[PDB]
């Protein structure tokens, strides 16, 4: 949507632990049609973990249902992913990305590494 996105909040945590991802926008976040968080490891296509519509609607991959919680704070132009009960399967580089339906790619972001080991 011609907006810059920058993810943060990743790190290394023990299995079962939590952390929270943030992705701040250079533009007004509340006016982006769709936004969402993708997990990616080498050799695997960006997997959509959770998404949020401009209206406030949310979607979640089944794996992460009840554990992860996407939200947006249009006030502070920031998108969040609250991750709980982390498994090793959740390990991967997490990107946030958004745009309107006219956008072919959308705005992404350099991503933030989440490692989960026990």
């Amino acid at each position: 949507m011609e907006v810059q996105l920058v993810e943060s909040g990743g790190g290394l945590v023990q299995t079962g632990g939590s952390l929270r991802l943030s992705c701040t926008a250079s533009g007004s976040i509340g006016s982006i049609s769709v936004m969402g968080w993708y997990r990616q490891v080498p050799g695997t296509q960006y997997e959509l973990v959770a998404g949020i519509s401009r209206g406030g609607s949310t979607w979640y991959e089944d794996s992460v249902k009840g554990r992860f919680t996407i939200s947006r704070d249009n006030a502070k132009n920031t998108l969040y992913l609250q991750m709980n009960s982390l498994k090793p399967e959740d390990t991967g580089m997490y990107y946030c990305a958004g745009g309107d339906y006219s956008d072919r790619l959308g705005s992404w972001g350099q991503g933030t590494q989440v490692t989960v080991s026990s």
């Binding site: 049609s33 769709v34 936004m35 969402g36 993708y38 296509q45 960006y46 959509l48 998404g51 519509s53 209206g55 609607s57 979607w59 990305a97 958004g98 745009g99 339906y101 956008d103 072919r104 790619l105 959308g106």
Partner: peptide
């Protein structure tokens, strides 16, 4: 990825207006 963003749009196509 194009198809990656597409899958996000797909979740909310049913909300355009």
């Amino acid at each position: 990825k194009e198809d990656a963003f597409s899958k996000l749009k797909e979740k909310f196509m049913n909300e355009l207006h």
